[PDB]
Ligand binder design. Structure first.
Ligand SMILES: *[C@@H]1O[C@H](CO)[C@@H](O[C@@H]2O[C@H](CO)[C@@H](O[C@@H]3O[C@H](CO)[C@@H](O)[C@H](O)[C@@H]3O)[C@H](O)[C@H]2NC(C)=O)[C@H](O)[C@H]1NC(C)=O
Ligand SMILES: CC(=O)N[C@@H]1[C@@H](O)[C@H](O)[C@@H](CO)O[C@H]1O
Ligand SMILES: *[C@H]1O[C@H](CO)[C@@H](O)[C@H](O)[C@H]1NC(C)=O
Length: 276
């Protein structure tokens, strides 16, 4: 092969080797294939017919614009699919067909602008979905998120997200077993509508390095099983009595905070402020 072998008959790195099509002079038993950095461009149906036993697949920066019905049709054991950095435009409404075991799906910087046309609804076995560094402005989990009854880390960081509205996290009301870590850092976010988080079950919640100056009263008060939160590196307005609630909450929830929310201008920790 022109590929490289790390574990014989098991692990192949076909990176950077100028491929225009999926290789095939490789063992049908292959469990780990890295194809990143090859002008693959398009993913027609049955693209991976010759590797029914693949567990991990890397297609990072492969210039892929289209993926069609059944490109991964015979990958019943795929656990991890890395699609990072492909200018995907057309995405077939059955592109993730036959990914029956899929656990980790990395769609980072793949030109996503809304999760709504994201055909992952039949991927019951999904545990983590990373859609950082896309073009999402309105982050509203669509209905299909019901099925994701195993989802436990959703990364939505470094998008274009400016607001959290109530509706956005609605679908999680009927997901009572959901132990869900939600990353929303490095968004240009300055506004959280009141009630956004009520009657929702978050294990972890990141809201740091946005542009939050304030949060509505009670925003977290009814937030089930929260274990960690991040609020640091935000321009917190520590005027009283605006900051009263968050200040109170951070003290009442000290164990859960990661880092420290500081006041803009001051630099003093938000938890340190006692309003009249
Ligand atoms: C996310 O958290 C939920 C809710 O806390 C988890 O539900 C819990 O599931 C366990 C089983 O994993 C239940 O324990 C069961 O009961 C007895 C122990 O008393 C044991 O003998 C049984 O064999 C069984 O393990 C537990 O009752 C239940 N919730 C609570 C706190 O009572 C769920 O596992 C988590 N789900 C995900 C998708 O991460
Ligand atoms: C494939 C399909 O259309 N079937 C639907 C789908 O929502 C889900 O896969 C199934 C089992 O929960 O219930 C029904
Ligand atoms: C790899 O596995 C194949 C198929 O089971 C076997 O025929 C072959 O001996 C192995 N290759 C070597 C020699 O590492």
């Amino acid at each position: 092969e022109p590929c490289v072998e790390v574990v014989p008959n098991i692990t192949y790195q076909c990176m950077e080797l100028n491929f225009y099509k999926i290789p095939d002079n490789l063992p049908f038993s292959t469990k780990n294939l890295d194809l990143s950095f090859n002008p693959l461009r398009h993913l027609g149906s049955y693209s991976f017919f010759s590797f029914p036993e693949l567990q991990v697949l890397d297609l990072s920066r492969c210039e892929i614009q289209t993926i069609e019905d059944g490109a991964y049709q015979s990958l019943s054991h795929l656990s991890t699919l890395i699609l990072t950095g492909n200018p995907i435009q057309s995405l077939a409404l059955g592109a993730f067909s036959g990914l029956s075991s899929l656990q980790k799906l990395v769609a980072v910087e793949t030109n996503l602008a809304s999760l709504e046309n994201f055909p992952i609804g039949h991927l019951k076995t999904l545990k983590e979905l990373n859609v950082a560094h896309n073009l999402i402005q309105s982050f509203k989990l669509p209905e299909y998120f019901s099925n994701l009854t195993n989802l436990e880390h959703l990364d939505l960081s470094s998008n274009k997200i400016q607001s959290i509205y109530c509706t956005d996290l609605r679908v999680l009301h009927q997901m009572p077993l959901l132990n869900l870590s939600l990353d929303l850092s490095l968004n240009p976010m300055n506004f959280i509508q009141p009630g956004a988080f009520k009657e929702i079950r978050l294990k972890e919640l990141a809201l740091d390095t946005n542009q939050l100056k304030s949060v509505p009263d009670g925003i977290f008060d009814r937030l089930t099983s929260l274990q960690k939160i991040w609020l640091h590196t935000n321009p917190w307005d520590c005027s009283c009595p605006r900051i009263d609630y968050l200040s109170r909450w951070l003290n009442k929830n000290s164990q859960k905070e990661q880092g420290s929310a500081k006041c803009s201008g001051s630099g003093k920790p938000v938890r340190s402020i006692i309003c009249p």
